[PDB]
Design a protein around this ligand. Structure first.
Ligand SMILES: COc1ccc(CNc2nc(N(CCO)CCO)nc3c2[nH]c(=O)n3C(C)C)cc1
Ligand SMILES: [Mg+2]
Ligand SMILES: [Zn+2]
Length: 295
């Protein structure tokens, strides 16, 4: 064992209220790497995943450290912090958004794992090493890294599942990670929006449920656009660093919000009214970006 593992396994995990992971406005700027690992343990714990699937504490701790280690720190935005924030928004949407009651335990377990793993080994939007070595090539690589870690010795947090549970969970994880491809979201959101605008959305149908899981993953993947203005400004700076280094930014932000985010969080609010803080935060950021664009 390394020094990081023994220090994390021996630490006391604060409650979800103390860690503020239940709030949609949560931010990680003030947290250290160890602190995000403890927040991740609390997410598994408070979703009853450690109990319902007999996860050993040292296995979950090693799995979290494996996931974090397989994100690249040199990447300005697509790193562990982005994955950690995607999972936190998933936790908040399940808890504060009351989506947890609409899903099964296996679905929740898969969503949390997928949210943390959905961008593993990302190299930046401008690096083509993965693609050089139908166009969901990056997301297939991310799931491949996720499956590799889940099968590594000491990291098998799904060992407590039966083959039927294990294969069902693996299938949901794969679909959830593949759903984080924006091309897939654009191709499929039309059916989701058409169902919602006719009061025809029903979660009991297996096809609509899998579509809801895909939209939920995108909503968490993009959730930085919903954060309080000081936080959203900071993350937008990280994104601009990845897009460029590795004056039209305000107008591009408004276009991104209009074309992608606004309708998604509106539809999510229709499924669960308690997810309104995400839609509200997205509207407030459109205000601040539009005012900067008019300047
Ligand atoms: C070079 O500077 C820029 C900066 C931003 C833009 C357009 N805005 C975007 N903003 C975000 N996020 C909002 C925070 O700001 C982060 C996630 O929510 N993601 C984006 C874009 N575009 C994209 O494809 N993505 C994907 C990575 C989803 C264009 C040029
Ligand atoms: Mg991704
Ligand atoms: Zn992502």
């Amino acid at each position: 064992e390394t020094r990081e593992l023994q220090s994390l396994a021996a630490a006391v995990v604060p409650s979800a209220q103390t860690l503020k992971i239940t709030d949609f406005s949560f931010s990680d700027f003030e947290l250290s790497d160890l602190e995000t690992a403890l927040c991740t343990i609390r997410m598994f714990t408070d979703l009853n995943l450690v109990q319902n699937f007999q996860m050993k504490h040292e296995v979950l701790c090693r799995w979290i450290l494996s996931v974090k280690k397989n994100y690249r720190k040199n990447v300005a935005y697509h790193n562990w912090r982005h994955a950690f924030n995607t999972a936190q928004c998933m936790f908040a949407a399940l808890k504060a958004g009351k989506i947890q009651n609409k899903l099964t335990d296996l679905e929740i377990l898969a969503l949390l794992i997928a949210a943390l793993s959905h961008d593993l080994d990302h190299r930046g939007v401008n690096n083509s090493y993965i693609q050089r070595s139908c166009h969901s090539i990056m997301e297939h690589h991310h799931f491949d890294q996720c499956l590799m870690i889940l099968n590594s010795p000491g990291n098998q947090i799904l060992s407590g599942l039966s083959i039927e549970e294990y294969k069902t969970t693996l299938k949901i994880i794969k679909q959830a990670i593949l759903a984080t491809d924006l091309a897939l979201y654009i191709k499929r959101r039309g059916e989701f929006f058409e169902l919602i605008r006719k009061n025809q959305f029903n979660l009991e149908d297996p096809h609509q449920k899998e579509l809801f899981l895909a939209m939920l993953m995108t909503a968490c993947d993009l959730s930085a656009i919903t954060k309080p203005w000081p936080i959203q400004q900071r993350i937008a700076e990280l994104v601009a660093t990845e897009f460029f280094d590795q004056n039209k930014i305000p107008s591009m932000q408004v276009g991104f919000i209009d074309a992608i985010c606004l309708q998604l969080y509106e539809a999510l609010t229709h499924v669960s009214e308690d997810c309104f803080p995400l839609l509200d935060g997205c509207r407030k950021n459109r205000q601040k970006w539009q005012a900067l664009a008019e300047q």
